[PDB]
Amino acid sequence: NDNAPVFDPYLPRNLSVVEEEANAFVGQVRATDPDAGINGQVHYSLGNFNNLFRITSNGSIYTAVKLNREARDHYELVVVATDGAVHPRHSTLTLYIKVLDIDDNSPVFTNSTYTVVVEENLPAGTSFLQIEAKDVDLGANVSYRIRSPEVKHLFALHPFTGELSLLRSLDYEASITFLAEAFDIYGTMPPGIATVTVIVKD
Numbered sequence: 001n002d003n004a005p006v007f008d009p010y011l012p013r014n015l016s017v018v019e020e021e022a023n024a025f026v027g028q029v030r031a032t033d034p035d036a037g038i039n040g041q042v043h044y045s046l047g048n049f050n051n052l053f054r055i056t057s058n059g060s061i062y063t064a065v066k067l068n069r070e071a072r073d074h075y076e077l078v079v080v081a082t083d084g085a086v087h088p089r090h091s092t093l094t095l096y097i098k099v100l101d102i103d104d105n106s107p108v109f110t111n112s113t114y115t116v117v118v119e120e121n122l123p124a125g126t127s128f129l130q131i132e133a134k135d136v137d138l139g140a141n142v143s144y145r146i147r148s149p150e151v152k153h154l155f156a157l158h159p160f161t162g163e164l165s166l167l168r169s170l171d172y173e174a175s176i177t178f179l180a181e182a183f184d185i186y187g188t189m190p191p192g193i194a195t196v197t198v199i200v201k202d
């Protein structure tokens with residue numbers, strides 16, 4: 001047993017794995033040990049994050065659990081190569097793991113139910129309520145729209161700001177309830193939904 005395991009010098013150190021997948025392949029390392037028999041046989045282990053990653057006998061690394069990018073997106077993973085000698089010799093490598101984002105969150109409204117009380121003579125053009133939804137995924141841009149067709153003659157919803165404005169003065173349709181949506185313009189998850197109730201003071 002003249003020497004330790006040495007990792008291949010040009011193994012990638014920056015590895016990326018998609019969030020929300022257990023048993024996902026992260027990458028593969030290799031350490032060689034130019035020695036005869038059991039002094040030349042390399043075994044792999046991890047020095048940290050053992051509940052989150054595992055390594056196989058050929059140096060392939062997999063997630064043990066679903067990673068959540070929204071909770072943490074980076075791991076400095078220590079890989080250990082040990083030979084089979086009676087006095088074992090070890091070497092280590094740090095890998096820098098990046099967790100990649102998927103669209104797994106719909107926009108979430110600040111309120112499940114917005115309620116607003118307006119004066120009967122509120123002028124046409126008044127913006128009287130702002131709604132707001134947040135999307136925790138990476139690069140998301142939230143846009144707003146009114147789902148319910150039957151109020152589209154009464155109110156307009158600004159697609160960027162979420163400001164709700166009056167199109168015509170109020171008379172007899174003393175409340176009106178409808179659904180608003182918030183969606184990631186380039187996302188794939190469903191829209192977030194919230195109810196809006198407008199109450200007219202007589």
Ligand SMILES: [Ca+2]
Nearest residue numbers: 003035039083
């Ligand atoms: Ca050796």
Ligand SMILES: [Ca+2]
Nearest residue numbers: 068069070104
């Ligand atoms: Ca997630």
Ligand SMILES: [Ca+2]
Nearest residue numbers: 101102104137
């Ligand atoms: Ca995500």
Ligand SMILES: [Ca+2]
Nearest residue numbers: 103105135137
């Ligand atoms: Ca999203």
